[PDB]
C-alpha cells in the first residue's frame, strides 16, 4: 500500500494525480475557448433572420388595395 489510510484527516495525495487532473481540466477550458473563438456562430446564429414586417408589397407581389 503506497497510500496509507488516515484517521479523521485529509488523505495523502500524489503529484501525478493532481497534475493530470489539472492538465485535463485546463484542456477542457482551452478547447471551449478555442472553439468558441472560431465557431461562435454555432452558439449564437449562423445567418441573419429577416423581419417579414419589412418586406415591401412590391417584392412580395401584393396588389394595391384597389386592384
Amino acid at each position: 500500500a503506497h497510500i496509507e489510510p488516515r484517521y479523521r484527516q485529509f488523505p495523502q495525495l500524489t503529484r501525478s494525480q493532481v497534475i493530470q487532473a489539472e492538465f485535463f481540466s485546463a484542456t477542457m477550458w482551452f478547447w471551449i475557448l478555442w472553439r468558441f473563438w472560431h465557431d461562435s456562430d454555432a452558439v449564437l446564429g449562423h445567418f441573419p433572420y429577416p423581419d417579414p414586417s419589412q418586406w415591401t408589397d412590391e417584392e412580395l407581389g401584393i396588389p394595391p388595395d384597389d386592384e
Binding site: P52, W55, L60, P63, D65
Partner: protein, 120 residues
C-alpha cells in the same frame, strides 16, 4: 412564434394555413414571375446518390461539397468553403419560403379588407 398566438388566439381568418398554402395563384399580383432554375441535372443527382430530401434547388452546392469531402480525405477540415456555399444556398431557400408565407398572409389580409369593404 408570435404568428402562432395570432392564429390560435387572435383571428385565424387572416393567417396562412401551413398545410394548404399557397391558396392564391402564383402569378396573381406579379406581372410575369420567373420560374425557379435548377442547376443540377436529374441524372447527376441520381449518380451522386443524394438523399431525396436533399435533391432540392441547392443540390449543385451539395454535389460540389461531397466531391471535395471525398477528395480531401484524410483532411476532415478541408471543405469549409464548399460547405458554407451549400449552407448559404439553403438559407436563401428558407428565406424564400418565409416570403411565401408572408405574401400569403398579406394577401389574406387584402382579401379580408376587401370582403369587409364590400359589406360596409
Amino acid at each position: 412564434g408570435a404568428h402562432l398566438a395570432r392564429r390560435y388566439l387572435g383571428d385565424a381568418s387572416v393567417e396562412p394555413d401551413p398545410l394548404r398554402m399557397p391558396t392564391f395563384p402564383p402569378d396573381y399580383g406579379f406581372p410575369e414571375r420567373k420560374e425557379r432554375e435548377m442547376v443540377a441535372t436529374q441524372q447527376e443527382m441520381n449518380d451522386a446518390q443524394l438523399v431525396l430530401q436533399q435533391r432540392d434547388y441547392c443540390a449543385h452546392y451539395l454535389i460540389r461539397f461531397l466531391k471535395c469531402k471525398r477528395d480531401s480525405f484524410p483532411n476532415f477540415l478541408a471543405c469549409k468553403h464548399e460547405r458554407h456555399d451549400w449552407d448559404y444556398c439553403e438559407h436563401l431557400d428558407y428565406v424564400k419560403r418565409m416570403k411565401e408565407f408572408e405574401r400569403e398572409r398579406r394577401l389574406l389580409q387584402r382579401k379580408k379588407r376587401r370582403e369587409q369593404r364590400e359589406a360596409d
